[PDB]
Amino acid sequence: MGRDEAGITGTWYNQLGSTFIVTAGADGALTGTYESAVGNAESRYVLTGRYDSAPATDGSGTALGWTVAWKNNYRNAHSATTWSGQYVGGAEARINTQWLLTAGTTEANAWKSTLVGHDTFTKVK
Amino acid sequence: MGRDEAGITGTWYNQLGSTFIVTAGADGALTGTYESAVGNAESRYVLTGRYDSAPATDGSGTALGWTVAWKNNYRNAHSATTWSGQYVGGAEARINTQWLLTAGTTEANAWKSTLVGHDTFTKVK
Amino acid sequence: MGRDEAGITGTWYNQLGSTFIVTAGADGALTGTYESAVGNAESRYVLTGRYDSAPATDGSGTALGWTVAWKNNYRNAHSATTWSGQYVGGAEARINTQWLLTAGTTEANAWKSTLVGHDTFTKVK
Amino acid sequence: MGRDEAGITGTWYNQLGSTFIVTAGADGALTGTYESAVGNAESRYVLTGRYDSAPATDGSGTALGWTVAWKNNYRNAHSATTWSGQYVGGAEARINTQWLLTAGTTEANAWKSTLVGHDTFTKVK
Ligand SMILES: [Cu+2]
Numbered sequence: 001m002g003r004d005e006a007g008i009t010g011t012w013y014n015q016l017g018s019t020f021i022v023t024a025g026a027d028g029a030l031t032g033t034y035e036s037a038v039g040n041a042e043s044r045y046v047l048t049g050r051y052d053s054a055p056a057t058d059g060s061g062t063a064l065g066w067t068v069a070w071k072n073n074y075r076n077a078h079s080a081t082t083w084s085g086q087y088v089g090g091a092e093a094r095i096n097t098q099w100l101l102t103a104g105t106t107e108a109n110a111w112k113s114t115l116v117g118h119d120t121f122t123k124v125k
Numbered sequence: 126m127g128r129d130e131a132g133i134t135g136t137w138y139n140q141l142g143s144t145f146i147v148t149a150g151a152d153g154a155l156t157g158t159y160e161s162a163v164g165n166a167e168s169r170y171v172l173t174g175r176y177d178s179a180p181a182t183d184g185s186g187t188a189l190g191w192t193v194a195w196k197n198n199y200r201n202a203h204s205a206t207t208w209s210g211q212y213v214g215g216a217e218a219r220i221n222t223q224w225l226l227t228a229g230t231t232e233a234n235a236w237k238s239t240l241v242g243h244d245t246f247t248k249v250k
Numbered sequence: 251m252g253r254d255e256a257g258i259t260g261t262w263y264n265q266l267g268s269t270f271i272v273t274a275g276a277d278g279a280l281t282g283t284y285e286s287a288v289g290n291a292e293s294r295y296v297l298t299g300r301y302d303s304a305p306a307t308d309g310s311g312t313a314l315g316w317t318v319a320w321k322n323n324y325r326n327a328h329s330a331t332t333w334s335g336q337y338v339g340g341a342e343a344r345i346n347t348q349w350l351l352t353a354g355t356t357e358a359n360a361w362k363s364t365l366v367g368h369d370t371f372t373k374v375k
Numbered sequence: 376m377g378r379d380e381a382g383i384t385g386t387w388y389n390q391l392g393s394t395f396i397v398t399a400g401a402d403g404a405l406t407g408t409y410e411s412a413v414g415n416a417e418s419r420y421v422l423t424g425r426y427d428s429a430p431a432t433d434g435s436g437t438a439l440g441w442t443v444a445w446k447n448n449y450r451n452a453h454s455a456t457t458w459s460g461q462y463v464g465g466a467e468a469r470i471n472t473q474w475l476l477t478a479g480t481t482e483a484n485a486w487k488s489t490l491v492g493h494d495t496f497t498k499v500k
């Protein structure tokens with residue numbers, strides 16, 4: 001019932017070799033799992049997020065975002081990443097994102113708490 | 126059952142006068158509503174996110190993040206914000222965040238799709 | 251000859267206790283020194299940057315930015331910070347910035363190369 | 376006399392078709408011109424910046440950054456971009472950056488003052 005519900009739902013892979021498994025709900029919900037190929041991470045982590053379920057029809061992408069807190073049954077990296085981006089449909093469908101990864105720190109170390117980067121997700125690798 | 130479940134759960138206010146209403150689950154879930162005092166927004170929007178439910182005990186903050194897609198029954202701003210940050214407990218409890226706000230754009234306009242900023246949330250105003 | 255040449259030129263202090271000493275040129279140049287109160291840094295480092303020497307007259311701030319590479323005669327932290335922001339004049343003059351601090355890394359570690367934060371500079375402390 | 380003085384100096388092109396012309400000084404200076412293929416920009420703009428003139432010899436990139444204020448003899452976009460990144464040498468030499476583009480705004484509009492993105496520069500197109 002959301003415009004790109006089918007387009008977004010499924011398995012995505014980024015340039016680092018990480019795996020993003022998501023279900024898009026009719027209501028705008030994103031739920032799934034994230035497995036990072038890098039960093040202080042092992043196996044799957046819960047993710048949740050939101051997307052625009054009624055995007056513009058003028059060729060614009062579909063805005064979305066999601067969060068992973070880096071705690072699961074195996075490890076806790078005392079940190080959380082949020083990806084903010086847009087889904088672009090078509091033959092080479094993509095989710096183009098920028099992300100913010102904040103670590104829990106002391107107040108004295110808060111200036112160095114947050115990494116920033118960019119991930120591009122595709123349906124194939 | 127999460128360490129800062131009680132600390133995080135409730136109503137928070139930022140420097141712009143926005144209102145963030147959240148429930149923290151034992152499992153690491155964040156669910157609630159966001160009302161922005163600024164921008165192309167009216168009333169409450171659904172949010173979801175994650176937090177570290179077993180933070181370090183060395184005085185470090187608690188990593189968390191959440192997403193709002195700016196669609197509700199009143200408006201659709203074809204955009205999504207993610208906040209990434211940490212909760213700092215104590216007498217003047219705070220959630221210190223940085224955020225990324227991505228708009229759905231054409232591919233030609235994607236270079237100007239994403240705003241970045243920083244919000245500090247407190248329990249009082 | 252630039253509108254805020256006099257306003258910008260001088261000594262500024264941020265929330266971390268760092269010291270930013272700058273001269274604004276008529277042509278839009280920023281030159282000076284930066285001393286960080288935190289991180290892998292000691293004493294003064296060269297900075298250079300640019301500002302809008304003919305800002306809007308509608309109450310808007312003055313856009314500017316500058317760079318420090320963290321090499322001087324004492325230390326080399328193999329990294330560079332850029333601050334991007336605006337100068338806001340008046341009785342409590344401020345330079346409000348966001349910054350990106352990139353470390354030289356191997357290609358395998360490039361995903362974790364860049365910190366992001368925000369500094370507010372004032373004329374007094 | 377700087378390790379990558381020769382490597383950095385010259386003409387670079389990004390994924391948008393913008394042109395970055397830079398001279399790297401022995402002392403860590405970057406000077407040159409920037410021509411954007413997009414946005415409120417026409418012709419060349421002055422840039423200045425800094426780079427690590429004595430990088431690590433362990434295969435790490437070379438940290439650098441620079442600023443453009445978007446005022447020249449043709450236009451004034453009341454804004455400034457800073458790029459923060461690293462130079463990676465070799466057969467396919469690259470400068471991989473993230474950037475912050477701040478517009479001069481009123482205090483009421485400062486929350487929406489800053490765009491963030493990422494540019495990759497190469498020696499060929
Ligand atoms: Cu619409």
Ligand SMILES: [Cu+2]
Binds near residue numbers: 076078180181
């Ligand atoms: Cu631990």
Ligand SMILES: [Cu+2]
Binds near residue numbers: 305306451453
């Ligand atoms: Cu004007």
Ligand SMILES: [Cu+2]
Binds near residue numbers: 326328430431
């Ligand atoms: Cu070294």
